[PDB]
Design a protein around this ligand. Structure first.
Ligand SMILES: Nc1ncnc2c1ncn2[C@@H]1O[C@H](COP(=O)(O)OP(=O)(O)O)[C@@H](O)[C@H]1O
Lengths: 64, 941, 339
């Protein structure tokens, strides 16, 4: 039962080579990027900042 | 064209060499041989005179003879051909032998057996097929192998060995790893001590060596060696030899538990020749790929698989005709598979005449390929809809074919009663309904499912989401009375290799499988092909008693159940044997695997044989529905046991018969009645009422010549017979009369069960190292409303002692304070036992007319229980404390087997008795259970 | 020889990957985010309740209109709700009672669902006769359909219990691509705004980034001690969060190829059933198996609020495409919209 174990173990190493052959980015920059993304889109998120009830279809109005 | 040289019935003997048309089946060969005998034979006149049924086809396999009973068997099924090809026997030989008529020996034997059974076995006046007679011709080979596989000497002696570990509360009684054997011989009481873990051979050798120069004192011939003797209880016949530590013998444990001496007497081995079994002359009796129309030309077609038939099942209900009617009326037909209703149909109101006709057709939804092997065609005449009649009919038969033609059936009138598959024997006042199943130029032969590599289980091997597992294993760990909603059946039917390694789930896995289809059953017969996590599982026999219940009718679910049971041991088998008997009713056919199990069990033990005999006889005398099936089983059994057992059965039957005559005479109506009792009993003594009949509830306790002055008639309702025989064993260490009560008019199917269930409960408590000392008094049922009850002497009805009383009475009966306290204990323990057991069995509430304080026990099994003041007073609270503690402890001990209690309760209320099941859940309900149970006790107090 | 050398090559490349990740782990997100103002308390109110399901609700999915949403339930029906009006645009009864997932198509014409049937049944709302007709039975999976998301009217990705994912072409009803590599049952997936990548969560306590175009595993993220129950992409598409039975959430960045943040509390002991991001991504809404649905600050990792509107397990939850409302399904047979 070597042809199966070997064919499997090769897929593993061919996958790990895929994953290891990637140019990662410093965690600091990944964070800065995400923080400045939220900072950018913070206004456009009514769940983060409660928007006026008039703009809320669920509260202000029953006709749609 | 297969060449077979036939041994002709007549002659040097003449042999005919043919070219058998092996393409077809045995019928072609029969026609060919007949024509060849007609033409070739010089003695062709002989066979010309004789018809076709005057010769039989028997072949010699490995020396013996086998019968070609079914011409419908195909050439491949003829194992002779394959046997010859392996042996290269070309041409083969089939002996064409001439028939013969029975001899008188056989007829007398058959009449004897039919007298024993109470019902003919060769009756063919109530059967619409040969299921019964083929069951009988098939049970032979298993019986021949079972008998050939017996040990003569040991079976003759039938040692009653055991292998359970010794309970603690007995290990205190045993000390020093030794016991005291009070050997007897003639009158000498030679006491010798031996270690509690010695085989009887060692004990006998040691006794021989020690008294090798004084045995003449014991009054034994000096010329005899050790093997010339074997021990034996005194007052019974239970021999004690074999290979077992002398601590493992149920009678030794009984003695130790009740604290009584051990007494033995030397004896001789019952010779094996007395166990001979009379020779028997009766010679011993496809898949879907080979049995399909597709791929064949119509002129080479002989069979049509049940699955090719895409059509719908339909039936023709011609009408009904009753000799006399005993409103609106209308029929309803159903298909059923183990209490399931696959499809339903009915008709319209009709006049209520003595005969009605429709010639109508009723069409079913289920295709003829979707039918399962075991479908029941129920036929229900309702009236107005208050059911008034019923009858059932299998659709496939025992020999793997479909029913086709006109059928006239006799209806039963109005449980396991409604699942019967036999026709009323009342052929002259029963309602008869005729029907036609459309015919087929070829027969419809359902194959058996082929198990094939099913890789959904093979390559789904990682573990499943711990969310799905968590919602599945919460469902599985429910009651065995759990209603499986189609949600649950689905979730489980997809996880059909997850719950294949969880035995505690099996009667919840196969409760989901849909039997209405054909792919489902193929998948479910591939599921059971890899069962390495069931066979080698834990042999829990409180589970296997749910794979042999009403809801399951498959041919392999019950097979795995019985495979589990095959590994039990003799005593275990004995404990539940009443339900195993009650669990052959549901076997859809007559021949099954549970029946062959009981057969094979009864031919290597004797206590099992005796109790099996009495239970089968009771049902044959009572269960008119299945009486034919039970009679077949019993008669297939009675041809294997030894002659001596036959004689003992005969004598017991004679005694019971005579006693029944006297009883029925007596209840025909003062002291004149008593004198007439005396006269009848004396005449019966004169009329050969024997004095040697192993009392049925005890295959060792023999009752001897009656003691006439002691009998009487009680003044209660039924007024039974108070018989008092005397032991027929001279060596008895005492002379107490073997008592019996004989009672007419009270159903003895309840009290016979309840006693088994409390015996099992005692076994469980013993396994849990306790002893609440309940008394199971041997009760057996003999006919309808007639039973023989063992007598427990030293007894007195509670009511009587009342007509501080109970306490005073006790203090009196025990002059010594030590005996008094040992009594007060043998009273506390037992009152607790009974209180808990009846609070479980839901019968505690009744007046005190059925209780006998020997110890304490109850009689005449018709609030949690009765705990009247006198009892507690006999037991401020010190003994009252030991009482509560033993109560609660036993209560929880038993609540750890609510699975087994519920299964036995249900399987009992479904087959024994004449919203009612739920009481076992509330009653059975640790702190919570303890508090609830203690509440019951406090309320009664 | 060949297998021991290949095993030691595997276990060397593994520590090369661990070192390539530890190298980038220069600063933590909790440090960088110490400065930003905490999000505070997201006091949420139950705006709607969706009655009509007869049994447990297993899945739901908002439409691109931000108004319609499908929901799957144990009762064997697939209902389409109007969040604004609560009216059922469709109440489709299903062939299989054990439906486990549903997915409103972005186009709004098709809806899909599936479950124990091992088939992704695609339904058409805009049928020729206007009825709810089954367009396709996407068969081929060897296990229960665990999740699926429409790429378009003709393409849909589905995950299953066979430990693989698959891209389908609705027209051919055939698995365009097959995403092999998982070693466990795949509980969830999530399409990135860019349809060329999607992540999937499995019982192996790991997630995998797949290339829709090609069909390869690009990166594999670990850190969970138990099965991953839910996963979705960060609004931007460069990070994603995973919910697990280990009672902890984690955030993963693709470019940093490692864990950035953990969202958990000592009080939280039960597993996470569902997750969703706010339109901005600052808020992560996690469903729990304790009738609660805690609101976390994605950057601060602080539990801003809790959504407790159900009497039973909150199995599923979602966010509108406009981030205007939050739906939360539960085992109590009720969904609830939040604002
Ligand atoms: N197994 C037994 N052994 C000895 N005596 C018994 C046994 N069973 C019942 N009796 C006696 O029979 C009497 C009760 O008869 P029973 O048949 O119970 O009356 P009823 O049928 O009216 O209840 C009691 O006096 C009791 O001593």
């Amino acid at each position: 039962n070597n042809t199966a174990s070997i064919a499997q173990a090769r897929k593993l190493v061919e996958q790990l080579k895929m994953e290891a052959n990637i140019d990662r980015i410093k965690v600091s920059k990944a964070a800065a990027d995400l923080m400045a993304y939220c900072e950018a889109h913070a206004k456009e998120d009514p769940l983060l900042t409660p928007v006026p009830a008039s703009e809320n279809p669920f509260r202000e109005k029953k006709f749609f | 064209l297969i060449p077979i040289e036939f041994v002709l019935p007549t002659s040097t003997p003449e042999t005919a060499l043919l070219h058998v048309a092996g393409h077809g089946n045995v019928e072609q060969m029969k026609a060919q041989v007949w024509l060849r005998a007609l033409e070739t034979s010089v003695s062709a006149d002989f066979y010309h005179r004789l018809g076709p049924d005057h010769f039989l086809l028997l072949y010699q396999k490995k020396g013996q003879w086998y019968e070609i009973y079914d011409k419908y068997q195909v050439v491949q099924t003829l194992d002779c051909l394959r046997y010859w090809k392996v042996l290269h026997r070309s041409p083969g030989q089939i002996h064409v032998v001439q028939r013969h008529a029975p001899s008188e020996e056989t007829l007398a034997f058959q009449r004897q057996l039919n007298a024993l059974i109470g019902y003919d076995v060769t009756d063919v006046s109530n059967v619409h097929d040969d299921e019964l007679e083929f069951t009988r011709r098939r049970l032979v080979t298993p019986r021949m192998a079972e008998v050939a596989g017996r040990d003569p000497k040991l079976y003759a002696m039938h040692p009653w060995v055991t292998s359970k570990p010794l309970p603690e509360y007995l290990l205190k009684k045993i000390t020093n790893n030794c016991v005291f054997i009070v050997i007897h011989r003639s009158t000498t009481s030679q006491t010798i001590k031996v270690s509690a873990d010695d085989t009887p051979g060692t004990i006998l050798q040691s006794f021989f060596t020690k008294m090798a120069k004084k045995k003449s004192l014991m009054d034994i011939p000096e010329s005899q060696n050790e093997r010339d003797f074997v021990l034996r209880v005194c007052g019974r016949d239970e021999y004690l030899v074999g290979e077992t530590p002398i601590k493992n013998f149920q009678w030794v444990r009984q003695c130790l538990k009740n604290g009584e001496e051990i007494h033995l007497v030397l004896d001789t081995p019952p010779d094996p020749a007395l166990d001979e079994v009379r020779k028997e002359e009766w010679p011993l009796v496809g898949y879907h790929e080979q049995l399909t129309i597709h791929g064949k030309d119509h002129e080479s077609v002989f069979t049509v698989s049940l699955w090719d038939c895409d059509r719908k099942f339909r039936v023709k209900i011609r009408g009904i005709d009753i000799p006399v009617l005993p409103l609106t009326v209308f029929v309803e037909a159903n298909i059923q598979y183990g209490q399931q209703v696959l499809c339903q149909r009915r008709t319209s109101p009709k006049p209520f005449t003595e005969e009605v006709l429709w010639n109508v057709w009723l069409e079913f939804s289920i295709k003829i390929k979707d039918l399962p092997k075991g479908a029941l065609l129920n036929l229900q005449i309702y009236c107005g809809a208050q059911l008034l009649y019923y009858v059932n009919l299998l659709l496939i038969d025992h020999r793997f074919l479909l029913r086709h033609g006109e059928y006239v059936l006799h209806m039963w009138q109005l449980n396991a009663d409604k699942l019967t598959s036999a026709t009323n024997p009342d052929k002259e006042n029963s309602m008869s309904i005729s029907i036609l199943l459309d015919n087929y130029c070829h027969p419809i032969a359902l194959p058996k499912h082929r198990p094939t590599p099913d890789p959904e289980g093979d390559r789904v091997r990682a573990e499943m989401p711990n969310q799905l597992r968590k919602q599945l294993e919460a469902i599985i760990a429910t009651d065995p009375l759990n209603p499986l909603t189609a949600e649950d059946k689905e979730l489980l039917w997809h996880f059909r290799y997850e719950s294949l390694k969880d035995p505690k789930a099996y009667p919840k896995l196969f409760s989901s499988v849909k039997w209405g289809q054909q792919e489902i059953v193929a998948k479910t017969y591939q599921l059971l092909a890899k069962r390495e996590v069931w066979d080698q599982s834990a042999l829990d026999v409180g589970l296997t008693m749910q794979l042999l219940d009403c809801n399951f009718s498959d041919e392999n679910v019950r097979a795995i159940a019985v495979q589990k049971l095959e590994s039990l041991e003799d005593d275990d088998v004995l404990h539940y044997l009443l339900q195993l008997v009650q669990a052959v009713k549901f076997e859809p056919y007559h021949d099954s695997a549970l029946a062959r199990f009981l057969l094979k069990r009864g031919l290597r033990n004797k206590r099992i044989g005796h109790f099996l005999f009495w239970f089968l006889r009771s049902e044959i005398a009572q269960s008119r529905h299945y009486q034919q099936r039970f009679a077949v089983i019993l008669e297939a059994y009675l041809r294997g046991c030894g002659t001596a057992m036959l004689h003992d059965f005969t004598q017991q039957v004679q005694v019971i018969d005579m006693l029944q005559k006297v009883t029925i005479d007596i209840k025909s109506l003062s002291s004149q009645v008593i004198s007439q009792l005396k006269q009848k009993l004396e005449n019966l003594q004169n009329l050969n009422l024997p004095q040697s009949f192993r009392v049925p509830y005890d295959p060792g306790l023999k009752a001897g010549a009656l003691v006439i002055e002691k009998c009487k008639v009680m003044a209660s309702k039924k007024k039974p017979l108070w018989l008092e025989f005397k032991c027929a064993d001279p060596t008895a260490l005492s002379n107490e009369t073997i008592g019996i009560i004989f009672k007419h008019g009270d159903d003895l199917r309840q009290d016979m069960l309840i006693l088994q269930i409390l015996r099992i409960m005692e076994s469980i408590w013993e396994t849990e190292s306790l002893d609440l000392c309940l008394l199971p008094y041997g009760c057996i049922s003999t006919g309808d409303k007639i039973g023989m009850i063992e007598i427990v002497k030293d007894a007195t009805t509670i009511a009587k002692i009342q007509q501080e009383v109970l306490s005073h009475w006790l203090k009196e009966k025990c002059p010594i304070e030590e005996k008094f306290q040992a009594a007060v204990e043998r009273f506390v323990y037992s009152c607790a036992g009974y209180c808990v057991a009846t609070f479980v069995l839901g019968i505690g509430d009744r007046h005190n007319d059925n209780i006998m304080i020997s110890n304490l026990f109850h009689i005449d099994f018709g609030v949690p229980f009765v705990l009247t003041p006198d009892f507690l007073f006999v037991m401020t609270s010190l003994h009252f404390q030991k009482f509560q503690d033993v109560c609660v402890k036993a209560y929880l001990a038993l609540r750890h087997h609510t699975n087994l209690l519920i299964i036995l309760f249900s399987m009992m209320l479904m087959t024994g008795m004449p919203e009612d099941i739920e009481y076992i859940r509330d009653a059975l309900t640790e702190e919570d259970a303890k508090k609830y149970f203690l509440d019951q006790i406090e309320v009664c107090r | 020889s060949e297998l021991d050398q290949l095993r030691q090559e595997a276990e060397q490349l593994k520590n090369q990957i661990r070192d390539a990740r530890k190298a980038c782990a220069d600063a933590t997100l909790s440090q960088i985010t110490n400065n930003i103002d905490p999000v505070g308390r997201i006091q949420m109110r139950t705006r709607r309740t969706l009655r009509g399901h007869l049994a447990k609700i297993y899945a739901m999915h908002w439409g691109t209109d931000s108004r319609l949403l499908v929901s799957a339930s144990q009762d064997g029906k697939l209902i389409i709700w109007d969040s604004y009006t609560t009216n059922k645009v469709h109440a489709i009864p299903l062939r299989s009672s054990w439906v486990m997932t549903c997915a409103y198509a972005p186009s709004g014409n098709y809806v899909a669902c599936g479950g124990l049937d091992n088939i992704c049944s695609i339904y058409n709302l805009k049928t020729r006769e206007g009825n709810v007709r089954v367009s396709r039975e996407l068969a081929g999976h060897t296990g229960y359909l665990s999740c699926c998301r429409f790429l378009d009217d003709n393409q849909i990705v589905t995950s299953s219990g066979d430990t693989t994912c698959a891209l389908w072409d609705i027209e051919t009803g055939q698995q365009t691509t097959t995403f092999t590599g998982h070693t466990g049952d795949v509980m969830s997936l999530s399409l990135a705004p860019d349809t060329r990548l999607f992540v999937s969560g499995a019982c192996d306590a790991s997630a995998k980034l797949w290339d829709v175009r090609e069909g390869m595993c690009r990166q594999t993220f670990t850190g969970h001690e138990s099965d991953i129950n839910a996963i979705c992409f960060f609004p931007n598409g460069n990070a994603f969060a995973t919910g697990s039975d280990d009672a902890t959430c984690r955030l993963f960045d693709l470019r940093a190829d490692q864990e950035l943040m953990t969202y958990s509390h000592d009080n939280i002991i039960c597993g996470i059933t569902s997750v969703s991001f706010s339109k901005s991504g600052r808020l992560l809404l996690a469903g729990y198996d304790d009738f609660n649905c805690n609101v976390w600050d994605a950057l601060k990792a602080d539990r801003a609020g809790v959504l407790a509107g159900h009497d039973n397990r909150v199995s599923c939850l979602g966010v509108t495409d406009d981030g205007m409302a939050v739906a939360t399904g539960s085992w109590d047979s009720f969904l609830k919209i939040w604002n």
